[PDB]
Amino acid sequence: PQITLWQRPLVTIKIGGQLKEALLDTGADDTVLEEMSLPGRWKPKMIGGIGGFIKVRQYDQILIEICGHKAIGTVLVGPTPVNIIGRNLLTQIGCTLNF
Amino acid sequence: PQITLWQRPLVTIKIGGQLKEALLDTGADDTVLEEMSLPGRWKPKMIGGIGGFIKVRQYDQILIEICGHKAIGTVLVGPTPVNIIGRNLLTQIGCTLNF
Numbered sequence A, B: 001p002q003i004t005l006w007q008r009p010l011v012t013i014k015i016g017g018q019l020k021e022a023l024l025d026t027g028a029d030d031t032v033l034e035e036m037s038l039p040g041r042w043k044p045k046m047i048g049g050i051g052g053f054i055k056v057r058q059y060d061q062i063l064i065e066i067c068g069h070k071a072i073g074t075v076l077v078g079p080t081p082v083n084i085i086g087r088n089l090l091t092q093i094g095c096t097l098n099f
Ligand SMILES: COc1ccc(S(=O)(=O)N(CC(C)C)C[C@@H](O)[C@H](Cc2ccc(F)cc2)NC(=O)O[C@H]2CCO[C@H]3OCC[C@H]32)cc1
Pocket: A025, A026, A027, A028, A029, A030, A031, A032, A047, A048, A049, A050, A081, A082, A084, A086, B023, B025, B026, B027, B028, B029, B030, B031, B032, B047, B048, B049, B050, B051, B082, B084, B086
């Protein structure tokens, strides 16, 4: 699909058997999801944004279906205010910016 | 231009007579620039991101040339770690997401 930006670019994702809404975020290097139950091992990490830093759990090789496109990669889980699909996954679904 | 997302989508902007680099950020509602000297009057504001909130100065009706495209609108100035072009200006230069 082609998505204009008059509204937030939200998509429906399926991850860990659950359905969520997430922002397609070209400004985010990594993918960061609100607290949720994800299976398996993880490593603690700290990531920085506009207001400071948050502690997240880093999960590798996680499968996500983003608007019907499958991708596998790192997903950070923690106290983000919004679910964010970052560039590590946007590249896998072939997402580009155009103007 | 079409921009893929294997690297940060940075562009050159001209604002208030100065040249800067800024991130095209579909995840950002508003445009937020690192501390810089802008001429006009302003209004204090607070904005929230992944790690909390920052205090910014709001400047309205600011002209920005973004990769050679002109736009006029609200620019926030304050302690953001990176210059962000948000959707309020991305729409004016016709920027879209495609996958
Ligand atoms: C290494 O991996 C990372 C992955 C993500 C982030 S990051 O902090 O999330 N960030 C990076 C920016 C600062 C370069 C992505 C950005 O898109 C963010 C995404 C987001 C959206 C909504 C939120 F509530 C919180 C975060 N935008 C945002 O801070 O927005 C503020 C200001 C603009 O205007 C408004 O827009 C919405 C809120 C206001 C860092 C590292």
